[PDB]
Design a protein around this ligand. Sequence first.
Ligand SMILES: *CCC(=O)N1CC2(CC(n3nc(-c4ccc5c(cnn5C)c4)c(-c4c(Cl)c(C)cc5[nH]ncc45)c3C)C2)C1
Ligand SMILES: Nc1nc2c(ncn2[C@@H]2O[C@H](COP(=O)(O)OP(=O)(O)O)[C@@H](O)[C@H]2O)c(=O)[nH]1
Ligand SMILES: [Mg+2]
Ligand SMILES: [Mg+2]
Length: 168
Amino acid sequence: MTEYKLVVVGACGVGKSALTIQLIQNHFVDEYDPTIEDSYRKQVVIDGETSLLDILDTAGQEEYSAMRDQYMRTGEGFLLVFAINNTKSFEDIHHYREQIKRVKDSEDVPMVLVGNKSDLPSRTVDTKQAQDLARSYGIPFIETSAKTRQGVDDAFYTLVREIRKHKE
Ligand SMILES: *CCC(=O)N1CC2(CC(n3nc(-c4ccc5c(cnn5C)c4)c(-c4c(Cl)c(C)cc5[nH]ncc45)c3C)C2)C1
Ligand SMILES: Nc1nc2c(ncn2[C@@H]2O[C@H](COP(=O)(O)OP(=O)(O)O)[C@@H](O)[C@H]2O)c(=O)[nH]1
Ligand SMILES: [Mg+2]
Ligand SMILES: [Mg+2]
């Protein structure tokens, strides 16, 4: 059984922990401690093929670390998470993709743009804007809500589809 290292990235408060805990434990966490960075395991079946996922939920300081370059380099696929009600989190997506590409020698890294908090009626990032950003990067765009669980499996499963294609 093939095992992949997934890394969830994005600005503080976008719902990285809430998305991950929904996928793993099937419940929505409000106010999860933003200093906790931890890895989770999950066996999934996608398109009739089993994969073991090792998901790293990034947290801690928004600072550079050679140690953090080392574990990001081991990542096979990345979720680029922003919140549809926070324009700054969306503008940050460019920096996250640039950062991942740097640590991985400019490889065409499997990534999926995730537009979280889709359950909120306080949108500031247009769907067209996020689709056009994913289009120029050549990656899928998935709209999620960690609160309602809408698109949670879609986001991680689509990243696994991208990793499978890249690995071919
Ligand atoms: C509220 C807590 C939380 O959820 N956080 C998510 C983060 C921001 C994440 N993050 N920041 C960087 C980063 C920050 C500054 C910086 C670099 C490089 N140079 N500078 C000044 C990177 C990273 C980061 C990434 Cl994405 C990668 C691929 C490699 C790397 N090496 N060192 C840092 C990083 C991340 C994940 C953490 C706070
Ligand atoms: N309404 C709504 N709230 C979310 C969603 N995802 C996360 N949140 C909330 O946003 C805040 C930050 O979430 P968290 O998972 O800690 O973000 P992280 O800092 O990126 O790990 C918390 O109050 C969460 O309950 C979502 O899809 N919808
Ligand atoms: Mg967190
Ligand atoms: Mg420090």
